[PDB]
Amino acid sequence: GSMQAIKCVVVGDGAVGKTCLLISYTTNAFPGEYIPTVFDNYSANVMVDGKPVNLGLWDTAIADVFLICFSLVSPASFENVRAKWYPEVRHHCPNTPIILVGTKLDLRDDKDTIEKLKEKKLTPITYPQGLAMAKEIGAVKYLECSALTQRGLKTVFDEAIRAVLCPPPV
Numbered sequence: 001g002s003m004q005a006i007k008c009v010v011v012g013d014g015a016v017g018k019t020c021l022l023i024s025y026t027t028n029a030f031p032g033e034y035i036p037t038v039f040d041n042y043s044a045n046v047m048v049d050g051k052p053v054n055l056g057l058w059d060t061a062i063a064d065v066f067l068i069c070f071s072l073v074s075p076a077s078f079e080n081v082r083a084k085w086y087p088e089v090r091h092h093c094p095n096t097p098i099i100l101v102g103t104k105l106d107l108r109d110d111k112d113t114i115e116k117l118k119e120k121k122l123t124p125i126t127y128p129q130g131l132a133m134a135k136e137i138g139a140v141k142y143l144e145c146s147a148l149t150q151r152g153l154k155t156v157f158d159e160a161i162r163a164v165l166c167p168p169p170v
């Protein structure tokens with residue numbers, strides 16, 4: 001083998017968890033240490049639907065697929081999905097698939113994160129809201145994950161890969 005190379009570019013507001021997402025997926029450990037500007041890309045060889053793939057993951061601060069990320073406990077990062085990130089991706093690339101990724105899923109039911117938001121008059125983003133935002137930006141998929149617990153983490157990348165190996169008919 002022979003593997004297919006796929007380039008995936010990850011974008012989203014500062015502090016939404018892009019770097020921790022990529023490290024947690026590729027090394028299988030959530031980082032408890034500082035991660036320099038040194039590393040701006042990560043890699044993983046993965047089997048998806050019986051196919052060996054080299055997934056190249058670019059951490060931003062000729063993509064085959066974009067991940068646009070917002071934190072499930074930051075309404076401001078969610079609004080920027082449509083106000084900033086969707087337009088910036090589409091200017092450069094009109095057709096490349098976008099996956100919309102809600103991060104920090106472990107906090108969406110967290111009592112103290114819920115309270116903290118509540119005292120600024122805010123609330124976590126819900127699954128239906130996220131799904132509606134994916135439709136609004138024409139994302140091929142909406143996924144939620146925690147880098148910390150790894151809940152939903154593999155699916156993000158499997159679906160980024162499927163987006164490339166299996167484009168829609170129309």
Ligand SMILES: Nc1nc2c(ncn2[C@@H]2O[C@H](COP(=O)(O)OP(=O)(O)O)[C@@H](O)[C@H]2O)c(=O)[nH]1
Binds near residue numbers: 013016104
């Ligand atoms: N609770 C929780 N915290 C997270 C998760 N992912 C990242 N964080 C935290 O969010 C903050 C920013 O993460 P980072 O990956 O540096 O965000 P970036 O600026 O988008 O690269 C850090 O303090 C991380 O520890 C997560 O899945 N759950």
Ligand SMILES: [Mg+2]
Binds near residue numbers: 018059061
């Ligand atoms: Mg980062």
